[PDB]
Amino acid sequence: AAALNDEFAALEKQYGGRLGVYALDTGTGRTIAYRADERFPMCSTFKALAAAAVLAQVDAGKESLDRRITYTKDDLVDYSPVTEKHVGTGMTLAELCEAAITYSDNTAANLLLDEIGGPKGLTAFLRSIGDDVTRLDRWEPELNEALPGDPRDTTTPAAMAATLRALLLGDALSPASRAQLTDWMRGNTTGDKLIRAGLPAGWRVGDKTGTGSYGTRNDIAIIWPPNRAPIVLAIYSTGSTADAKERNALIAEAAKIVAEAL
Numbered sequence: 001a002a003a004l005n006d007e008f009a010a011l012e013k014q015y016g017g018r019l020g021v022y023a024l025d026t027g028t029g030r031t032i033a034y035r036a037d038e039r040f041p042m043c044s045t046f047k048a049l050a051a052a053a054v055l056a057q058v059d060a061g062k063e064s065l066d067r068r069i070t071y072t073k074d075d076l077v078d079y080s081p082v083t084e085k086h087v088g089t090g091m092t093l094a095e096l097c098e099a100a101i102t103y104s105d106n107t108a109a110n111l112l113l114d115e116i117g118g119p120k121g122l123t124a125f126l127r128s129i130g131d132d133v134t135r136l137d138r139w140e141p142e143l144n145e146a147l148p149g150d151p152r153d154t155t156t157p158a159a160m161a162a163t164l165r166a167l168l169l170g171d172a173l174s175p176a177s178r179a180q181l182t183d184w185m186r187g188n189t190t191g192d193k194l195i196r197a198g199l200p201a202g203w204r205v206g207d208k209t210g211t212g213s214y215g216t217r218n219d220i221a222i223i224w225p226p227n228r229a230p231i232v233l234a235i236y237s238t239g240s241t242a243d244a245k246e247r248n249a250l251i252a253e254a255a256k257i258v259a260e261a262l
């Protein structure tokens, strides 16, 4: 409510820009919503959805995770630490999903989009599982432009939360794929300074980060506290004016506030 809105508003003033939060404690049904229905640029948070879409093709017997994908240097875009090592041998869809999630590998993400029907295909998938809000329009790296007032390549914290819940806890995917997406997000290496840094120590998190222009910094996660039902958390921020270290701190702090209020 208003008291809590004041706190998130103080963060927005502190860092500049615009902050969105949706959190849901599945064990009590309590939620936190701040700009939860406003659009924010997804940046790399879509890569979890891209992997999901590949898994959904496998569930439907139309695809195999072992299938080897060949690619060239014409496919390499910036920030592709994993794929930039396997041009010669190629990589499997499993390896590409893992790389896109755990290392936010841009080239791997574009490759997943290839096998999925592109941004329009990924969006189509999202509609198929009840997400009528989230939209991907472009490929890496252009999708990170994060232009103010631009609806392309956006979600809302509430839509992304609902979607992540369906994918990781609901029945949008088979048990095997759901478990596989779960393992990948838990194995993320890019999220240490963000949601993970704001939560109490013993809480297990699977997450996917995002970084983009106009000072965009995001993180979406499922959280498994000991002896409790899981929490779904989507945090988006854009437009802030702060260094890399403190954009990280903005997200961690919002996460910390959430754990106190939820």
Ligand code: NA
Binding pocket: 043, 044, 045, 104, 209, 210, 211, 212
């Ligand atoms: Na990113």
